[PDB]
Amino acid sequence: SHMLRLSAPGQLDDDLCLLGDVQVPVFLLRLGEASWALVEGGISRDAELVWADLCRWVADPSQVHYWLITHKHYDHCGLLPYLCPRLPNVQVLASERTCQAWKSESAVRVVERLNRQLLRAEQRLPEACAWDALPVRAVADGEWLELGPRHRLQVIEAHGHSDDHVVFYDVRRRRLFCGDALGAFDEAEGVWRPLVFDDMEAYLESLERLQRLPTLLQLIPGHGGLLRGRLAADGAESAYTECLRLCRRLLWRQSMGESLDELSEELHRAWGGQSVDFLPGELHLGSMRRMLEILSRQA
Ligand SMILES: O=[N+]([O-])c1ccc(OP(=O)(O)Oc2ccc([N+](=O)[O-])cc2)cc1
Ligand SMILES: [Fe+3]
Ligand SMILES: [Fe+3]
């Protein structure tokens, strides 16, 4: 592995642990002697694994007070109905738009169906909270989240990947929980893979703004672990660069009369192997196609 990327379960920093699979992690923040927060909501089929890992660090789960959610995609909120009932004092903090999603029938349907596709043959999910019954408090762009005496995180709107996406910045630690707004970090090549699934102009504007944060020490996307050193410092800028590079590649190939699919299959082939364990294959290729449709339209 690489010194600049922490990608093992367990303790990452004095106050921060990784629960579950590094590909779809849940982060555990220790806010004080008797108080904790989770960040990112995972996939439903990992409920027992994440529960098990949580109970190793947290003797009393009633001390889990907050659960921060970056966006409504099925792989970032799948655990909520299954673990919220075991966390009697938890408050889920999400954007207004993300909250809206959990109150839409069609939306919840998609999230459940994509989560069910990842179930292994054996397993049963535990009893679930109704999605519209989750203990949520909507948070606003620019809001300060006073989680504990040494944990204060600012909510920053970061749409583009999705129309509801937010990130959470801990300026004390120069630590940014970025969700999928920078794309997917390619563990093999050390570069960002763009994930433009809603709006290219918003996605790029969000990265412009994140580049203006004070220099990052820790950059924690939605998949793959914790990035540090130059990868954190240069992250938002690099993510922007990689988006433009994809745009131009698309423009090249289309100018050679290629159809949206040549590049899609090329991307699905070049990148699909990293997510195969949490993205159904038809979804990865289809996500590629959608992103290329978006870039094409807006360019
Ligand atoms: O069907 N959706 O609305 C949807 C699409 C992609 C998606 O996964 P996301 O985590 O946004 O996309 C990724 C795509 C590829 C990789 N990868 O190259 O390792 C990671 C995340 C989640 C939900
Ligand atoms: Fe996503
Ligand atoms: Fe994701």
Side-chain angles (χ1 to χ4, degrees), residues 1-123 125-264 266-268 270-299:
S1 58
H2 193 297
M3 55 154 298
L4 293 189
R5 175 171 163 259
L6 297 182
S7 65
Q11 205 149 265
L12 300 183
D13 202 337
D14 302 302
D15 64 318
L16 178 60
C17 294
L18 189 156
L19 309 178
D21 178 356
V22 190
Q23 300 194 289
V24 206
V26 175
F27 299 97
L28 178 65
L29 291 177
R30 183 159 197 164
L31 304 172
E33 277 177 55
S35 185
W36 304 82
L38 299 169
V39 191
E40 293 278 24
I43 52 171
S44 306
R45 67 106 189 272
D46 290 345
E48 297 303 345
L49 180 66
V50 168
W51 185 247
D53 281 356
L54 175 66
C55 288
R56 304 187 86 168
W57 301 95
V58 181
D60 181 359
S62 77
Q63 298 179 347
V64 178
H65 299 142
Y66 303 105
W67 194 348
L68 285 60
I69 298 292
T70 55
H71 69 293
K72 69 189 175 179
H73 285 173
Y74 76 98
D75 56 315
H76 296 269
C77 62
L79 285 164
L80 298 176
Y82 306 98
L83 295 184
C84 285
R86 303 190 178 168
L87 295 170
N89 279 332
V90 78
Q91 196 171 231
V92 173
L93 304 185
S95 79
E96 189 50 83
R97 270 129 95 116
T98 306
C99 287
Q100 287 167 23
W102 296 330
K103 284 187 161 188
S104 156
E105 269 170 18
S106 74
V108 158
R109 203 187 291 128
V110 171
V111 171
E112 291 183 343
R113 169 191 120 260
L114 290 160
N115 274 293
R116 178 181 339 119
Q117 291 178 33
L118 293 184
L119 281 167
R120 337 282 193 188
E122 88 270 1
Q123 59 177 150
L125 293 171
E127 172 67 59
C129 188
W131 286 94
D132 60 358
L134 286 170
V136 303
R137 170 193 133 202
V139 298
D141 185 27
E143 183 170 346
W144 281 105
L145 309 175
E146 312 287 352
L147 309 181
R150 297 182 324 126
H151 290 79
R152 177 154 182 284
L153 280 67
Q154 186 160 34
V155 182
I156 304 165
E157 195 162 85
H159 292 169
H161 177 69
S162 73
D163 66 0
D164 65 312
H165 194 119
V166 300
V167 303
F168 302 103
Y169 182 54
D170 180 345
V171 73
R172 173 200 280 262
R173 300 183 176 73
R174 302 299 189 96
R175 182 190 284 168
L176 183 61
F177 292 91
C178 68
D180 286 348
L182 279 57
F185 193 66
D186 191 319
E187 308 162 10
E189 304 290 10
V191 296
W192 292 88
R193 295 168 166 191
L195 303 174
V196 188
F197 303 146
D198 194 65
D199 178 324
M200 180 194 99
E201 164 183 348
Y203 180 97
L204 289 170
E205 191 280 333
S206 294
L207 291 173
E208 304 171 14
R209 272 187 295 116
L210 293 171
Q211 287 174 62
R212 297 190 227 114
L213 294 166
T215 307
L216 305 186
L217 288 168
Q218 303 176 330
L219 179 62
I220 305 171
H223 304 288
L226 179 152
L227 306 171
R228 75 200 172 166
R230 72 169 177 84
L231 294 181
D234 292 340
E237 187 176 11
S238 294
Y240 186 106
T241 285
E242 297 300 310
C243 193
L244 292 193
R245 181 185 189 83
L246 182 58
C247 286
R248 289 180 224 117
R249 190 166 176 190
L250 179 63
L251 184 111
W252 186 252
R253 287 171 163 245
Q254 303 204 282
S255 302
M256 309 210 107
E258 292 182 9
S259 79
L260 279 193
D261 313 343
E262 324 218 5
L263 179 54
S264 289
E266 173 55 33
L267 298 184
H268 176 64
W271 311 341
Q274 197 166 278
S275 58
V276 59
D277 208 59
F278 68 91
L279 268 82
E282 283 306 304
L283 190 52
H284 185 270
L285 174 65
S287 299
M288 304 297 99
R289 177 98 217 301
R290 183 196 340 191
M291 165 163 63
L292 294 180
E293 295 176 306
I294 289 173
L295 301 191
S296 292
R297 274 177 193 288
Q298 309 190 39

